[PDB]
Amino acid sequence: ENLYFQSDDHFGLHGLVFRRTFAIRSYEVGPDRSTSILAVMNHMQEATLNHAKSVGILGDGFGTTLEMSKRDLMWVVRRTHVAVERYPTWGDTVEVECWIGASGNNGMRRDFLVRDCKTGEILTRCTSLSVLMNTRTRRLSTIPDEVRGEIGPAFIDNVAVKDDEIKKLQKLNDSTADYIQGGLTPRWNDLDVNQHVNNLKYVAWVFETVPDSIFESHHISSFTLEYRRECTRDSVLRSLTTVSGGSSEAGLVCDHLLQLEGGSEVLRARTEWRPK
């Protein structure tokens, strides 16, 4: 019912939703033949960058528009929520539907829908919240009008994930964590365009302390991350995970924490699991 959601040839309008097909590759699936959530998030990240190009948003970046680039501003992801119904397998063809939208006066949200091309079933729903940061002062910035003039006309109001589904996360008690791993350090290729560690590197470090027994038995159905701080090449991190068993009423839950070791919080995260 939103005209600008449809493709260009539907209404003769410049559409604001990017679409792209992915065929699941061999190295993207685990021993259980399921695509990993890291491959799914890779897909959405790739669709992100393509989307900016498709709506007439400027030169990269990974981001980063001119008005932003003039003001030494960059996007930083501060929240991510992923809802997974079913993971595709090798050879399956999926389609990512992605777009951007406002989040208050100074936030921007990117939302994603991934469908199974054969069944038309929705496999993945996601939304990520980004904010502006000054690269020099490492300080959060409001969105200047020159930047709103760039990304604003690309906004649509649709959501893939309702607020109801996203719960504010509690930091786990790091002194009673079920699993802990320190000495985590980024290497040369793990860094981004501006001195900072890749966003999906963080996700990898989160899974460092998830026991293999949970990966063998369960699939991630929900994934929520709250980022609070960037990391550099000389960062050394500690990953922590706390398991909230599922053996009655309650399903399997994992709480997560990346900290600078020690012990300023880098992020907190929460995974919900379902039996395979």
**Catalytic amino acids?**
194, 196, 231
Q: How far is the CB of 208 from a second copy (least distance, A)?
A: 9
> Among residues 180, 257, 251, which one has the least CA distance to residue 218?
251
| Cβ partners under 8 Å of residue 44, min gap 6 | 96, 98, 112, 114, 124, 126
With CB under 8 A as the contact rule, the residue among 173, 216, 263, 276 that binds a second copy is: 216
With CB under 8 A as the contact rule, the residue among 121, 145, 157, 192 that binds a second copy is: 192
With CB under 8 A as the contact rule, the residue among 42, 158, 181, 244 that binds a second copy is: 42
DSSP helix/strand/coil, 217: helix
* Contact pattern from residue 256 through residue 275 relative to a second copy, giving x for each residue in contact according to CB under 8 A and a dash for the rest: --------------------
CA distances 247 to 220, 222, 244, 272, Å, are: 17, 18, 10, 14
* 12 part of the interface to a second copy, by CB under 8 A: no
Window contacting a second copy (CB under 8 A); options: 103-111, 138-146, 168-176, 193-201 = 193-201
* 187 part of the interface to a second copy, by CB under 8 A: yes
* 70 part of the interface to a second copy, by CB under 8 A: no
Q: What size, in residues, is the chain?
A: 276
* 155 part of the interface to a second copy, by CB under 8 A: no
Sequential DSSP letters for 84-141: ES---BTT-EEEEEEEEEEETTTEEEEEEEEEETTT--EEEEEEEEEEEEETTT--EE
Residue 249's φ and ψ, nearest 5 degrees, are 50, -70
142/195 with CB nearer a second copy: 195
Point out which residues bind a second copy (CB under 8 A).
Answer: 25-27, 30-31, 33, 36, 42, 45-46, 48-49, 61-62, 90, 187-189, 191-193, 198, 200, 212, 215-216
